[PDB]
Structure formats: structure tokens, C-alpha cells
Design a binder for this molecule. Sequence first.
Ligand SMILES: *[C@@H](CC(=O)OCC)[C@H](C[C@@H]1CCNC1=O)NC(=O)[C@H](Cc1ccccc1)NC(=O)[C@@H](NC(=O)OCC1c2ccccc2-c2ccccc21)[C@@H](C)OC(C)(C)C
Ligand SMILES: *[C@@H](CC(=O)OCC)[C@H](C[C@@H]1CCNC1=O)NC(=O)[C@H](Cc1ccccc1)NC(=O)[C@@H](NC(=O)OCC1c2ccccc2-c2ccccc21)[C@@H](C)OC(C)(C)C
Lengths: 188, 188
Amino acid sequence: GPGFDFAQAIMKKNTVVARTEKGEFTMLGVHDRVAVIPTHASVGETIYINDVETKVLDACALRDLTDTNLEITIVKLDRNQKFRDIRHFLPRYEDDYNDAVLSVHTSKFPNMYIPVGQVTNYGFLNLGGTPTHRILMYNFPTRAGQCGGVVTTTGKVIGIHVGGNGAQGFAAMLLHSYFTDTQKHHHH
Amino acid sequence: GPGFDFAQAIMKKNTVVARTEKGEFTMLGVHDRVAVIPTHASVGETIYINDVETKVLDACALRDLTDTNLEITIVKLDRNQKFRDIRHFLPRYEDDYNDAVLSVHTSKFPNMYIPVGQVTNYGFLNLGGTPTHRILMYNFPTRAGQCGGVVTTTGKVIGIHVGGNGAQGFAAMLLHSYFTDTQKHHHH
Ligand SMILES: *[C@@H](CC(=O)OCC)[C@H](C[C@@H]1CCNC1=O)NC(=O)[C@H](Cc1ccccc1)NC(=O)[C@@H](NC(=O)OCC1c2ccccc2-c2ccccc21)[C@@H](C)OC(C)(C)C
Ligand SMILES: *[C@@H](CC(=O)OCC)[C@H](C[C@@H]1CCNC1=O)NC(=O)[C@H](Cc1ccccc1)NC(=O)[C@@H](NC(=O)OCC1c2ccccc2-c2ccccc21)[C@@H](C)OC(C)(C)C
């Protein structure tokens, strides 16, 4: 069966409601004060987190070496609470998955779970006019309001929901190497 | 934890999408060709079931001995498929419950699960101007589109979602005695 228990533990301890100029998004906290949000959320220098205005200390819109959108933006937030470190639940590599759950945490849906079935390493997607890479696909009619939703299997947090076409849903991959402690680089 | 596995088994085998003049509702099939739907769905002599026009052979809008709305309408449908008999999962008596799940099956949400936490035997509710009895209440911000949604705990199907006020959700109780094989009574 789908790993509902795992999805619930991730949602309970590692999600907040984020709100930008573009609306509300489920937001996955990954470690310390670092979280993710879809790039098309258009994060600025402040953001609402559970309706509390919060400084965005850093925001990195990920792109691959072809200079193509990956649709993940990693943010560092000025908050007191640390997120439980869930980096060990992130996949090392691209993969396909079975019996995944999509989990949403917004004002409208504070806690909701959708089994999306098989998830395929899809690759290239034209997302609302933006070429995008490293997309995961599931055959489920996902809707507006579900962006940022966390895609899991038991023991793995594999991506965040970013798009759909009325029949299929698409998530941006999360990989373990996106969040490893590193060194010195001018990035803005 | 919440009984997601049980909720999923009920949804998989015992729900259809019903559509009346008032819109779409999750519809729980109980046994044979007998199902339930909230009375405010305004069931007529035909109904759409998974988008297929279907004759409604009988419809009984339940009321208690005070002649007050219970908000459950039991329907008998002209379909080929029988529903798996789930009467043994229906509670005998009114009760309070822990860690319930609300499960929705509509066109917009073909499969969605919401843990609603504690469910209380609430009693009287004024439902959109209609006095209504035998209501179950949960502290969860349920929304339009969730009516008919099935409320479960492990091993019990306890009600169907009928209402909310933005902070709380309300279900009409299901009791085992609503569906027992009986005898001869002019009811229309
Ligand atoms: C989540 C964010 C949101 O609700 O918007 C607020 C600004 C939302 C989820 C999806 C909406 C529809 N169902 C969903 O699962 N994502 C988007 O709207 C996303 C942009 C975005 C905005 C903000 C944050 C993150 C993302 N855009 C779309 O999902 C877009 N879909 C899309 O481009 O799909 C690709 C299609 C494609 C590729 C190749 C050949 C043919 C097609 C095709 C045909 C028909 C439809 C889509 C595609 C949505 C907005 O596009 C449609 C046309 C479905 C409305
Ligand atoms: C499901 C059916 C649907 O979507 O409508 C299509 C016709 C829907 C679910 C609920 C909507 C809001 N959140 C939900 O969970 N149910 C209804 O709309 C239901 C009527 C119905 C129509 C068709 C089938 C089955 C049912 N009506 C309401 O839910 C109504 N809520 C309500 O009456 O709550 C009682 C309130 C009460 C009692 C005593 C003191 C104070 C109050 C109070 C204060 C403020 C709000 C409600 C109540 C909705 C429609 O009413 C509001 C005002 C929330 C819009």
C-alpha cells in the first residue's frame, strides 16, 4: 500500500504554509532554516510563513548545467524554529517510484493526502512556456492549490508538486546533493 | 495513527461519483445496489453515476421520530454491479470516535484523504436553515466539494460529510439499523 504514515510524519514536522505574491504553496522544510518552494512562486525578500511575515535570507533558483530551470528554489528563512533534518530521506539519484503519495498543507487544505500511484522519471517538460528539466510524472489529475505538495514513498521524499495538464501531475525532483554543506561562491 | 488503509479499501470498492442537479458528491455504496447521498443533493428519478445516467429506483430521505431531517438519503440504483456488502462495518449505536479520516471521490478529487482527528456525537445542527439531528462533528476546515465524503475509523464507516462552518465539519451518522432487510410499508 501507499506510505501514508510516512507522508503524515513528513507533513507534521516538516511543512509550513508559504504565501508569496503568487498565492499559497505547501512548503517543505529540509534542514535548519532551509526550505523549498517552486520557482514559479516568485519568492521575494520577504514571505509569509503560517501567515507570519518572514525575511528570506537567501533564495537560490536551481538550474542545471544546460542553464535550464529545475523549478526548485531553495530558501533560507529568518525564523526561530529549526526544521527537523530530513536530508537522509532524500534520494541520491534520479529514479522511478511506486505507489507515491502527494501531501498538501495550505490554508484551504491544512492536511490532505492523495495517492498518485506510479511516478516516472519524465525529464523535459514545457512548464507554462518555461523549458524545465528533471521532472517526475504521475497519472493523476492534480489541481491548482497543490503546488509545493510533497511527493513521498515510504522513507523517501522525492519531489515537490509543480504542474499538471488535467490528466497528469508533475513534480520537480529533490536530490540529496542539493542540500549538502559546501564552500565559497558568489551566487547573486 | 489514522486508519488510512481502511479508508482506502472502502474508497476503492465502495464509492462512486454521483451527480445530481446540485452538483457532484462522493457516494458510498452500502450493499447490493443501495447507496447513500446527502438529502440536500436533491436526488430525482435519475442520477449520474461515474458520468453514466442511472435510474433511481427508490430514494428514502431519512427523518427521525421528531420528523426532523437526518440528512441521509438512501437510494436504490438500476446498475449491473453490486456493491460489496459493508453493513458489518456500520456502527450499531451513536458514539464518539478518535482519529477519523474523511475520504473524497469526485471528478475534481478522485481519491483524497483528510485526517480530521476527534469526532464527537454533536446532535442538533441548523444546516443551512434546516433543523437536522444525529450529527457528528470534527474540528477541521472542510470545504465545498467534500459532501458525501466518507468518514471512517479502522473497521468502522461512521458517517457521510454534509456541512461545515469554515472551522468545523459535520457528518450525518450512519447506523447499522438503517440498512437491515425488513418488511411491508407504503413509504411515498
Ligand atoms: C500549482 C501553482 C498554482 O496553482 O498557480 C498559482 C500561480 C499549479 C498546479 C497545476 C495547475 C493545473 N494542475 C496542476 O497540477 N501549477 C501551475 O499552475 C504551473 C505554473 C506554476 C505556478 C506557480 C508555481 C509553480 C508552478 N503551470 C502549469 O501547471 C501549466 N501546465 C503545463 O504547462 O503543462 C504542460 C503541458 C504540455 C506540455 C507538452 C505538450 C502539451 C502540453 C499541455 C497541454 C495542455 C495543458 C498543459 C500542457 C498549466 C497552468 O497549464 C494548463 C493549460 C493545464 C492550465
Ligand atoms: C457540501 C455540499 C456542497 O458543496 O454544496 C453544493 C450545493 C457542503 C460542505 C460544506 C460547505 C462549507 N464547508 C463544508 O464542509 N455542504 C453544504 O454546503 C451544506 C448544504 C448541503 C448542500 C448539498 C448537499 C449537502 C449539504 N451547507 C452548509 O454546510 C452550510 N453550513 C452551515 O449551515 O453550518 C451551520 C452554522 C451554524 C449553526 C449554528 C450557529 C451558527 C452557525 C454558523 C455560522 C456560520 C456558518 C455556518 C454556521 C454552509 C453553506 O454555510 C456557510 C455560511 C458556512 C457558507
